[PDB]
Copies of this chain bind each other. A is one copy, B any other.
Amino acid sequence: INHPRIGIGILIFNNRNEILLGKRISSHGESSYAPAGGHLEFGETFEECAIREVLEETNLIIENPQFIAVTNDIFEKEQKHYVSIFLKAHCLNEHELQNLEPHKVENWQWFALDNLPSNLFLPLKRLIEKKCYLYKEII
């Protein structure tokens, strides 16, 4: 069966309150921006997963991630259904940013919240336009 899956997304903030986004380039050459994150693993808390995923992807250490939002999205093309849980955290070591999954992400960069790219990964787009169940404002 094709069951709904649970994804964790992390809005990682730096000292200037910018957020980290990762550029992905598709097979059609289309670019989109996504935050850090990936699949909740069996046995994990949302906060454990967030911390682990951020470290694995970016080399950044975040602390005390805060629950922000839930989105429920079906990806038509891929026939995938994800419930995304978003959390936010400040990183402690922003100068140690490294692209640790360069086959998945072209590059990471910091963006001001008033200067986000347009082409955002669907769940993040939903979050930004508040088409989600929003616990806390991002700011």
Q: Using a CB–CB distance below 8 Å, which chain A residues touch chain B?
A: 1-6, 39-43, 45-46, 67, 70, 72, 74, 81, 83, 85, 133, 135
Q: How far apart sit A45 and B67, CA to CA, in the bound complex (Å)?
A: 21
A4 touches B4 (CB 8 A): no
Report yes or no: B81 in contact with A43, Cβ–Cβ below 8 A.
Answer: yes
A42 and B2 contacting across the interface, CB-CB below 8 Å: yes
Of B5, B46, B67, B135, the residue contacting A3 (CB under 8 A) is: B5
Give me 6 A-to-B residue pairs in the complex whose CB atoms sit less than 8 angstroms apart, sorted by A's number. Answer: A3-B5, A3-B6, A45-B72, A67-B133, A83-B83, A83-B85
Q: Give chain B residues whose Cβ lies under 8 Å from the Cβ of A133.
A: 67, 135
Distance between A36 CB and nearest chain B CB, rounded to angstroms: 18
Q: Determine the chain B residues whose CB is within 8 A of the CB of A46 once the complex forms.
A: 72
Give the nearest-CB partner of A134 in chain B.
B135
Chain B residues with CB under 8 Å of A81's CB are 42-43
Question: Which B residues are CB-close (under 8 A) to A39?
Answer: 3
CA distance A86 to B32 in the complex (A): 31
* Shortest CB distance A3–B (Å): 6
A67 to B70, CA, bound (A): 10
